[PDB]
Subunit: 135 residues, 2 copies
């Protein structure tokens, strides 16, 4: 099924809506009530994962998916709704079921962060079997 | 605020904190495991740091997350209690770094570091508006 090529750059573009602020991450949080209306770090983490997931999708076999096992990034500029965040993900290596990525993001105005992200390829159903032993 | 001081909060994972709920906009997430998302785990960690700093902030001040470096090494289905601890590791300028860790009552699910910068809300909000289309 042809594997992924190291050093290949992939881009994921995302126009930030109003509902990806700090407060929308945890509406349960009174303590976030005053947070500026900017793209939340937690949502940026999810966007970077999302970028890597799209890239690996055609390469995964039937029944397969992945989980994020590590993330190590800066978040050095804030983004209001309306700007487009472009994520660039580049494959650093694959060693077994472990894929390592470098990732970075730009909102068309500033670079907003960069660093690394690691994922693990899993068989979706047999993973749920392991999880359910916890539920 | 002092280095080495700690705050811990607990959070029963609901169904709506799973991966696919972080981004309902994503078809590529539709078949994701029904487990607590990394983005939400990070958010719960930030939340711990935010609460712990609050009593030490001047009125009109707040903070932003400027760095996050964590592992997420075990998955948590809805219904388990995630306990998060945040320990102040250092302060310099308007930046505080925390050591953060999380466990779900069964496994340690992740840990690492998180940095935040203290901001004057009004000043910062003005800046944001000038970056807005």
């Amino acid at each position: 099924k042809d594997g992924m090529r190291v050093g290949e750059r992939f881009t994921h573009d995302f126009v930030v809506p109003p509902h990806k602020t700090v407060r929308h991450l945890y509406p349960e949080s009174p303590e976030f009530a005053e947070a500026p209306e900017v793209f939340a770090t937690g949502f940026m983490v999810g966007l970077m994962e999302w970028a890597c997931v799209r890239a690996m999708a055609p390469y995964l076999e039937p029944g397969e998916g992945s989980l994020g096992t590590a993330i190590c990034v800066t978040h050095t500029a804030a983004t209001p709704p309306g700007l487009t965040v472009t994520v660039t993900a580049e494959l650093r290596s694959v060693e077994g079921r472990r894929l390592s990525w470098r990732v970075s993001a730009h909102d068309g105005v500033d670079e907003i962060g960069s660093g690394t992200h690691e994922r693990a390829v899993i068989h979706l159903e047999k993973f749920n079997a392991k999880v359910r032993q916890k539920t």
